[PDB]
Design a protein around this ligand. Structure first.
Ligand SMILES: Nc1ncnc2c1ncn2[C@@H]1O[C@H](COP(=O)(O)OP(=O)(O)OP(=O)(O)O)[C@@H](O)[C@H]1O
Ligand SMILES: Nc1ncnc2c1ncn2[C@@H]1O[C@H](COP(=O)(O)OP(=O)(O)OP(=O)(O)O)[C@@H](O)[C@H]1O
Ligand SMILES: Nc1ncnc2c1ncn2[C@@H]1O[C@H](COP(=O)(O)OP(=O)(O)OP(=O)(O)O)[C@@H](O)[C@H]1O
Ligand SMILES: Nc1ncnc2c1ncn2[C@@H]1O[C@H](COP(=O)(O)OP(=O)(O)OP(=O)(O)O)[C@@H](O)[C@H]1O
Ligand SMILES: Nc1ncnc2c1ncn2[C@@H]1O[C@H](COP(=O)(O)OP(=O)(O)O)[C@@H](O)[C@H]1O
Lengths: 38, 384, 380, 253, 245, 145
């Protein structure tokens, strides 16, 4: 009744994103006004 | 306890029921119609044994249509004209003949499994009068959730738009998760049991559609109730987050607060959220429109405790000398859940002396144990 | 010891009998069907094996004086025809029909129209109007002047000499009615509307969501005078950065399908845009540049006068005595939002129901405020 | 028959016809290796000495609700559902959970901390849930845990949340709707070296109904710790190992 | 025996379900149930082993099974007694065990080698392998640290999963003072994971495991910094020192 | 060429102009118009264009938001991480495949330069640059008029 094949391949890309990280050192100011400047 | 005569009535009625249905099935059934004789004899004649499944991106009148699907490529396909042809729509799901493709039937939902897990089938035995520690916190939400299924005239005569969604926070050990399993006993509508952590998945864009499922399935299956617990999992607070995982937590937080109130209305879906620390979380998910009130649980006072242990201890013998009424005198920094332990340890601490019914020594021998663990809250003693 | 011998087994007998019912009935399920035209099944089989085989779609790339194709999955052929017209009816581009056995062409069909975007159009018109809004009377005027007047009265904007703007943005704190005024204007549209679901732009296959963006507009400018309502673009229109983890890398590639499409080489005609936020600082500057956003609006909090006209909306359906004075309730509700008033109008009504009265009062409103807002000596 | 199929199970299909002819089991879950034990450890209660009162609380909570719990229905109280045991290192606490396995008759699961974490968003909180279901079908069952995923008294910032979300699901399982309605035979043990750092949440009764102090020993205490370690040594005659303890208090055990 | 000939096709056993039937998830991509044949072992299959299948049936057929240090204690310089102590700690327990059994004790587990650099620590340990022939795993402590959460303790647990497999085996770590130093507390998120590193390392030796590994050979430049909870006897009990000048 | 600088200095506009005044053809492609799901959908697309531009010559190319593909090397073995950059690897070989005899002339644009891969900036490929500034106050007078 049917002679064709299908050949289900992985022609599609894909991805899994949980790029979870730790540090975040971005920007500590301990001199918000330099604390008497002097 | 001689409740049995209120028990031997029903199993005999579970038996007479068992008497009826097999009898109702066994030859008092009357099968002769064209359905069992003609209908069901034809479908399996053309419907093969395997019926594949897929979707469809577009349709044409006169039994000509299209399919998409993972294992195979697309197709141009005909219809057999017994599917309620003026039903189906894009995005639907289908029943495809196997040797040749052909749209033959369509399913109702086929939504997802996990949503079909979280629903209730059983019913937890806990109830009101399993707790009696309080009077108001029970009430201040009950009138949101349990009357409108019974007594809604009182909300249309006064004629307003009732509330749909609350939150219940406070210090632990006080019976938050409890108070859900009570109301879910006596609701008459469906129910959903969740944690906010459940609904984040590794892949990029599986949550935000998941949250769009359950706020769909509850809508169609109205009336309905939802219960998120420890939602500070996912909805706590937002920041800019130069990262790639924290944001997929936000998209769920942002799609949720679209469902609860946005462009299109949700229906009759009554949320119940729980949490142990608000001020360290929850920016805008906590406002009216979404949650129209906010309940405060705290560690009990004196007079509540008089009713707490009385129901924990309505079964133990304890008949001698206890004088409960000065057992728990001050605040003592203990919740209703430090009660359940003390009724426990002082139950068996008797038993290890091979005595069953109890005295006070067995109690205070426990109370000294629990309270021992307490951190020195008055480690300061600086404030005379 | 007297009777408990029985209760421990008879109770554990129910479940034996209960599931004993599950082994009595069976199961029942359906999918579809029909009663009156119950005799469908004479035309089916004759319709089946005839000249109604299936096809396996593709789309051409070249018509060499034969007929190259490219399947959906990457497999490219070069083919011929049966009875379908070779030279004339076909051209490049279109969707087609190909056999399953030896790949001849047999039938065209039009270009693709994804479901999702048609799941994204709105057809039934909501109910609110600018008379149901809470008296933010100015900010609407900056809104509609973008949207409808360049579609109804362009004879003013054009003749004087101004090319109107074609893009707004809305920002204010929550509970303030950013989405309200936007569901409204769909009522008074006089053209179409779109409710973009942001959840469909972040699929887990690369370069896909962007495909949904551009098709969102190919159908728009096809249509005449479309407008669009995003919401919570803080998800999509987030800022940019460089990280060798960068797990938001993909969603950046989507939005670039947007901004390149909004301002470059004018695929746009008359389509306008609408946005909404609670975080208007983080989102990238490119999406708040003129050209893209020629206009933006601050739904700041209300004032006492405008605060009142919120009550007059949410109070009409209610049973209340004539003689309350709102100029307390407003005065006594400090800086707060549309919603936190709507909860108040409500909960004045609920405390009635807690006592089984039938009409509200003036105090029950006040007894609501202390419950919503929630003493101090160093001010008196 | 097509009604006894406990759904979401795992079966066979026939090539070219797609027809069922067998049934298989729910297991082959991904995390099983460290997630249970197929062969028991080797230790027992007389390999340990110096403390036995501590034991009596364990077998009071663990074994009685499992061995014959008809009793509690007479005593009119609730079964318990967990403990926790604290004290310095070098006392023999992780010893005991190796040793409890020998003499259970119910199975055993063990998770050092840091096996839960799996570096994606929800790969952790899917993993805890993949644990408890593996318990219930194999019921009854015991779990043993060194725990610092539950470290931190709920600090509030960015990427210390990714384990908190692995912490908070587990609190549900111990007193969820279903957990409190289901966690009747499942049981739990956990350990530590500190309890000045954890939440106050795990430390409630309803999740850990009692807790234990493992202190370092007396001198007469330690003497039995040596006889067991020396049972295979030769031990020439003129020994007073009641003294060696006193010449140096082993401040550990 | 015919079909047991070529051309076979590969796969990968997963698990059994019966005395005469198992399953496979081949390399071709899909998963298949399949029946083993007799005239074949069973003791050797349960893990994700390697296998061979019959193509059309997708049946099962038969099983199939499968750095170099060059130094020696004369190629090294002198360093006499330091050498003598690791021959006691490391060489004996691998080729001699009745020694430690009959006395009434158990072997010591690994050691550490403190003392200033450029001193023949690492090379000694290589020679030790070269005599005893056992496997060898060299690795550095600044590799266990990693920025993606949990991307470190996966490592420390992964090597032991194989350092048992190729047993008898040992390890060298040319630096551990980096990730090992006493700290009064962590007011930080990153440095807390350093504890999650260590506490698994400290867990693997002490928890239930095999006995042929003598894995840990901690190298460093000082020893006045480590956690005494790492020095709990059972973990490490043979301090070692080398010259400075 | 390349035209770096911030939003609103007249980048895309100017390419609307240069395509007009010159009596040659002109071409366009947003960068994300290149990237596509399937694992051979992009690279074939770009080998076509430049080849098509060697045909129909002389030509001009416009790449509007190069900040998408041109970031850096996002090292991985996943699908989605490879198929992206592998386009860039074709773009380079396309630039270094022809000469300054055949009369193409490519350019580009961006809002960013602290984000993209210097291999494009290597001597020969995209060398001449333009630091589109903000406008001085004299220029403010022209623009409004
Ligand atoms: N009034 C009361 N009567 C009886 N039990 C009480 C009462 N108040 C508190 N409890 C006890 O408190 C326990 C429930 O604690 P609770 O449900 O508040 O934890 P939880 O914070 O909800 O947990 P989670 O945060 O995971 O939801 C029950 O075991 C219950 O016995
Ligand atoms: N000005 C107003 N007049 C009357 N009702 C209002 C007003 N503003 C807000 N509301 C109430 O708030 C709801 C919508 O508020 P709004 O549009 O501010 O939500 P939102 O800001 O889109 O929410 P989010 O910030 O989470 O997106 C409506 O259902 C309405 O009941
Ligand atoms: N009473 C005892 N009998 C036998 N051995 C003991 C005893 N007390 C301590 N030990 C010894 O102590 C060691 C176990 O220490 P312990 O298990 O307390 O640390 P730990 O619990 O593993 O620490 P952590 O669980 O925090 O990693 C074993 O090597 C054991 O021989
Ligand atoms: N120097 C200029 N001369 C004339 N018009 C200008 C100038 N600078 C900006 N404009 C105006 O700004 C718009 C063009 O902006 P431009 O094309 O620079 O945006 P862009 O920087 O390309 O945005 P993106 O970089 O995100 O593509 C036009 O509408 C134009 O009227
Ligand atoms: N006593 C010695 N005999 C022979 N070679 C030595 C000796 N001491 C040091 N070396 C040399 O030092 C080098 C290795 O130093 P190494 O042990 O790696 O330093 P570290 O221990 O700090 O890593 C080798 O090349 C080796 O030749």
């Amino acid at each position: 009744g049917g002679k064709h094949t299908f050949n289900n391949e992985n022609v599609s890309a894909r991805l899994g994103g949980a790029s979870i990280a730790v540090q975040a050192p971005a920007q500590p100011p301990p001199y918000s006004h330099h604390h008497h400047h002097h | 306890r001689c409740k049995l005569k209120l028990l031997r009535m029903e199993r005999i009625k579970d038996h007479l029921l068992l008497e009826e249905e097999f009898v109702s099935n066994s030859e008092i059934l009357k099968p002769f119609e064209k359905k069992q004789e003609e209908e069901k004899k034809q479908l399996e004649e053309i419907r093969g044994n395997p019926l594949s499944i897929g979707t469809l991106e577009e349709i044409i009148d006169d039994d000509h249509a299209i399919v998409t699907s993972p294992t195979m490529p697309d197709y141009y396909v005909s219809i057999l004209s017994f599917v309620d042809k003026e039903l189906l729509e894009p995005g639907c799901s289908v029943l495809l003949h196997h040797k040749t493709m052909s749209i033959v039937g369509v399913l109702q939902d086929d939504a997802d499994p996990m949503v079909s897990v979280m629903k209730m089938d059983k019913s937890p035995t806990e109830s009101y009068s399993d707790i009696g520690g309080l009077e108001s916190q029970i009430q201040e939400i009950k009138e949101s959730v349990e009357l409108p299924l019974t007594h809604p005239e009182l909300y249309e005569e006064m004629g307003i738009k009732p509330p749909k969604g609350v939150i219940l926070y406070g210090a632990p050990g006080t019976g938050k998760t409890l108070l859900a399993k009570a109301v879910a006993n006596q609701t008459s509508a469906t129910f959903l049991r969740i944690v906010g952590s459940e609904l984040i998945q590794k892949y990029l864009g599986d949550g935000p559609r998941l949250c769009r499922q359950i706020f769909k399935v509850a809508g169609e299956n109205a009336p309905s109730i939802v219960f998120i617990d420890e939602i500070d999992a996912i909805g706590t607070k937002r920041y800019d987050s130069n990262s790639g995982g924290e944001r997929e937590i936000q998209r769920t937080m942002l799609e949720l607060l679209n469902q609860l109130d946005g462009f299109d209305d949700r229906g009759d879906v009554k949320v119940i959220m729980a949490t142990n620390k608000i001020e360290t979380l929850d920016p805008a998910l906590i406002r009216p429109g979404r949650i129209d009130r906010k309940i405060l649980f705290e560690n009990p006072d004196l007079s509540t405790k008089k009713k707490i242990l009385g129901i924990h201890t309505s079964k133990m013998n304890l008949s001698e000398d206890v004088n409960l009424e000065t057992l728990v005198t001050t605040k003592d920094d203990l919740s209703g859940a430090d009660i359940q332990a003390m009724c426990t340890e002082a139950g068996l601490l008797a038993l290890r002396e091979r005595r069953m019914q109890v005295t006070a020594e067995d109690f205070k021998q426990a109370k000294e144990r629990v309270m021992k663990n307490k951190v020195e809250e008055n480690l300061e003693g600086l404030y005379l | 010891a007297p009777y408990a011998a029985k209760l421990k087994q008879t109770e554990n007998d129910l479940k034996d009998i209960e599931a004993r019912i599950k082994e009595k009935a069976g199961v029942k399920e359906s999918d579809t069907g029909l009663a009156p035209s119950h005799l469908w099944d004479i035309m089916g089989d004759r319709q089946r094996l005839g000249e109604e085989h299936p096809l396996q779609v593709a789309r051409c790339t070249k018509i060499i004086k034969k007929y190259v194709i490219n399947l959906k999955q990457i497999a490219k052929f070069v083919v011929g025809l049966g009875e379908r017209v070779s030279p004339t009816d076909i051209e490049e581009g279109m969707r087609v029909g190909v056999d399953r056995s030896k790949y001849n062409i047999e039938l065209p069909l039009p270009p693709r129209i994804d479901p999702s975007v048609t799941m994204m159009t709105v057809e039934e018109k909501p109910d609110v109007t600018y008379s149901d809004v809470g008296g933010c009377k100015d900010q609407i005027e900056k809104l509609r002047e973008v949207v409808e007047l360049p579609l109804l009265s362009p004879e003013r904007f054009a003749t004087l000499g101004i090319d109107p703007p074609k893009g707004i943005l809305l920002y204010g704190p929550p509970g303030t009615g950013k989405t309200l005024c936007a569901r409204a204007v769909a009522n008074r549209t006089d053209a179409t509307f779109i409710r973009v679901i942001g959840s469909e732009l972040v699929q887990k296959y690369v370069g896909e969501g962007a495909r949904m963006v551009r098709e969102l507009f190919e159908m728009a400018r096809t249509k005449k005078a479309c407008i669009i309502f995003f919401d919570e673009i803080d998800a999509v229109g987030g800022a940019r950065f460089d990280d060798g983890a960068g797990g938001d890398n993909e969603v950046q590639r989507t939005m670039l399908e947007l901004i390149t499409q909004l301002d470059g080489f004018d695929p746009r005609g008359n389509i306008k845009v609408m946005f909404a936020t609670n975080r208007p600082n983080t989102l990238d500057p490119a999406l708040l540049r003129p050209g893209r956003i020629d206009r933006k609006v601050e739904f700041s909090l209300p004032d006492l006068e405008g605060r009142a006209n919120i009550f007059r909306i949410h109070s009409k359906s209610m049973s209340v005595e004539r003689g309350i004075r709102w100029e307390l309730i407003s005065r006594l509700c400090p800086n707060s939002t549309g919603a936190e008033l709507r909860s108040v109008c409500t909960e004045a009504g609920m405390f009635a129901i807690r006592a089984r009265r039938k009409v509200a009062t003036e105090k029950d409103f006040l007894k609501a405020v202390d419950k919503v807002i929630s003493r101090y000596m160093q001010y008196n | 028959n097509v009604k006894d199929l406990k759904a979401s199970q795992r079966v066979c299909l026939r090539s070219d016809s797609y027809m069922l002819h067998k049934v298989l089991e729910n297991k082959a879950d991904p995390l099983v290796s460290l997630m249970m034990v197929e062969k028991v450890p080797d230790s027992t209660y007389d390999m340990v000495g110096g403390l036995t009162k501590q034991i009596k609380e364990i077998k009071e909570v663990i074994e009685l609700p499992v061995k014959h719990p008809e009793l509690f229905e007479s005593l009119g109280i609730a079964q318990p559902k967990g403990v926790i045991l604290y004290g310095p290192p070098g006392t023999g606490k992780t010893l005991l959970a190796r040793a409890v396995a020998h003499h259970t008759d119910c199975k055993f699961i063990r998770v050092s901390g840091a096996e839960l974490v799996q570096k994606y968003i929800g790969e952790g909180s899917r993993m805890v849930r993949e644990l408890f279901v593996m318990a219930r079908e194999h019921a009854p069952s015991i779990i043993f845990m060194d725990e610092i995923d539950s470290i931190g008294s709920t600090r509030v910032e960015g990427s210390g949340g990714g384990d908190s979300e692995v912490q908070r699901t587990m609190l549900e399982l111990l007193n969820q709707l279903d957990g409190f309605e289901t966690s009747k035979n499942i049981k739990i043990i956990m350990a530590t070296n500190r309890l000045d750092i954890l939440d106050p949440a795990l430390l409630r009764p309803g999740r850990i109904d009692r807790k234990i102090e493992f202190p370092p020993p007396s001198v007469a205490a330690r003497a039995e710790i040596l006889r067991i370690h020396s049972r295979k040594m030769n031990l020439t005659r003129g020994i007073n190992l009641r003294k060696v303890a006193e010449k140096m208090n082993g401040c550990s055990g | 025996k015919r079909i047991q000939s070529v051309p076979l096709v590969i796969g990968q056993f997963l698990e059994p379900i019966d005395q005469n039937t198992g399953i496979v998830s081949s390399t071709t991509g899909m998963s298949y149930v399949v029946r083993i044949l007799s005239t074949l072992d069973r003791e050797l299959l349960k893990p994700s082993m390697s296998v061979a299948l019959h193509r059309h049936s997708n049946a099962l057929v038969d099983i199939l099974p499968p750095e170099k240090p060059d130094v020696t204690y004369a190629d090294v310089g002198g360093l006499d007694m330091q050498k003598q102590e690791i021959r006691e700690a490391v060489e004996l327990p691998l080729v001699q065990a009745d020694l430690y059994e009959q006395i009434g004790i158990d072997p010591p587990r690994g050691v550490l080698l403190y003392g200033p650099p450029g001193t023949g620590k690492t090379m000694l340990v290589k020679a030790v392998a070269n005599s005893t022939k056992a496997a060898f795993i060299r690795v550095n402590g600044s590799e266990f640290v990693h920025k993606y959460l949990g991307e470190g303790p996966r490592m420390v647990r992964d090597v032991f999963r194989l350092a048992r497999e190729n047993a008898p085996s040992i390890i060298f770590i040319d630096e551990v003072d980096s990730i090992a130093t006493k700290r009064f507390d962590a007011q930080t998120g990153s440095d807390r994971e350093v504890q999650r590193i260590l506490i698994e390392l400290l867990t693997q030796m002490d928890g239930f495991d095999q006995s042929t590994n003598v894995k840990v050979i901690m190298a460093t430049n000082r020893a006045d910094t480590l956690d005494p909870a790492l020095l709990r006897p059972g973990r490490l009990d043979r301090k070692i020192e080398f010259p400075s000048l | 060429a390349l035209m770096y600088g911030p939003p609103g200095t007249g980048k895309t506009l100017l390419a609307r102009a240069c395509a007009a005044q010159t009596n040659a053809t002109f071409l366009k492609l947003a960068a994300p118009q290149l990237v596509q799901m399937y694992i051979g959908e992009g690279a074939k697309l770009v080998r076509d264009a430049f080849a098509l531009a060697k045909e129909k010559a002389p030509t001009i190319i416009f790449i509007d938001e190069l900040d998408a593909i041109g970031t850096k090397r996002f090292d991985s073995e996943k699908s989605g991480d490879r198929e992206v950059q592998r386009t860039m690897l074709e773009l380079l070989n396309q630039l270094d495949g022809f000469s300054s005899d055949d009369r193409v002339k490519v350019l580009a644009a961006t809002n960013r330069v602290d984000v993209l891969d210097p291999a494009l900036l290597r001597s020969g490929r995209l060398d001449r640059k333009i630091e589109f500034p903000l406008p001085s106050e004299d220029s403010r007078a022209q623009i409004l008029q």
